[PDB]
């Protein structure tokens, strides 16, 4: 029934209030074809990278307003080690390949009690730059610690604070008003999403395939999928209850096809 144990490799996780694995865009997203933009033999999956990678996410208080979100880039969380999410045998292989191509199977745990209210919107958003600061560089670990939650201002709703190339002193700098990597917060449920309600479940189960402009994108730069935990209804609890419930997430890369072996990535 509602007790699903998902054994993968050696790291098997459990849940007793599951809603069902939201397989996205296909029936079985585990099945995937090898890339057609490579002539060398691809490093397929093996039993050290077919496993669940559990990380941490920032806590969730009453001070979190509506639509204050928190983005986990994939596989950008393996590189920067966001939330302590260390890949181990996957990060040490993804730094030694130029073309990576995998589908993701994420699972966000957040254990609300029957006396709490509030609802997360855990969604897998394709192709956004929500981690990257508008100057052009990605956020560090302290910058993902000083704020704990990215507030949905006018710049995120419209698409105004996305990174850009500066025009220079020759041109007159325009009034920047729009950019196509916006968030429409009222329309995040078009993405593969499950609501982590306080009264139905403690873990959402999303399964996404590989999408991308090329049959295999780069390894050290891609932002194909992006885990996006958005607060729809703010947290509320009477005093005496368990304060600030923590949020985790478990990521399993389904069927990776690495290509282009080279040495470890040094800028």
């Amino acid at each position: 029934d509602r007790v699903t144990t998902q054994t993968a490799g050696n790291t098997a996780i459990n849940t007793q209030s599951s809603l069902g694995v939201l397989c996205a865009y296909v029936e079985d997203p585990t099945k995937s074809d090898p890339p057609s933009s490579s002539t060398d033999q691809p490093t397929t999956t093996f039993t050290a990278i077919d496993r669940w990678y559990t990380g941490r996410l920032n806590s969730w208080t009453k001070a979190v307003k509506t639509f204050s979100f928190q983005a986990v880039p994939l596989p950008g969380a393996f590189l920067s080690r966001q939330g302590g999410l260390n890949g181990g045998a996957f990060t040490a292989t993804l730094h030694r390949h130029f073309l990576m191509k995998c589908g993701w199977q994420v699972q966000v745990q957040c254990n609300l009690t029957q006396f709490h209210q509030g609802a997360l919107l855990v969604a897998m958003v394709p192709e956004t730059t929500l981690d990257v600061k508008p100057d052009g560089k990605a956020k560090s670990l302290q910058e993902l610690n000083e704020e704990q939650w990215v507030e949905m201002s006018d710049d995120y709703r419209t698409g105004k604070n996305m990174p850009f190339q500066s025009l220079g002193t020759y041109y007159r700098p325009p009034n920047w008003t729009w950019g196509p990597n916006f968030i429409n917060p009222y329309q995040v449920t078009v993405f593969p999403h499950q609501i982590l309600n306080a009264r139905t479940s403690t873990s959402v189960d999303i399964n996404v395939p590989y999408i991308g402009e090329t049959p295999t994108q780069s390894s050290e730069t891609q932002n194909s999928w992006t885990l996006l935990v958005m607060v729809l209804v703010p947290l509320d609890y009477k005093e005496g209850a368990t304060t600030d419930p923590e949020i985790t997430f478990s990521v399993r890369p389904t069927s990776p096809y690495f290509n282009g072996l080279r040495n470890r990535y040094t800028t």
């Binding site: 069902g20 694995v21 939201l22 397989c23 996205a24 865009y25 029936e27 593969p192 399964n207």
Partner: protein
């Protein structure tokens, strides 16, 4: 076929008019499958 009302006759061939893909080797399905 899209917004094409020319049911009868194509002068230029299918490779010149359209752009086919080279090979490697009513009913609206949902975009999310609960399993």
């Amino acid at each position: 076929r899209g917004n094409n009302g020319n049911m009868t006759f194509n002068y230029y061939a299918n490779t010149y008019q359209n752009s086919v893909d080279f090979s490697t080797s009513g009913i609206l399905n949902p975009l999310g499958y609960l399993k």
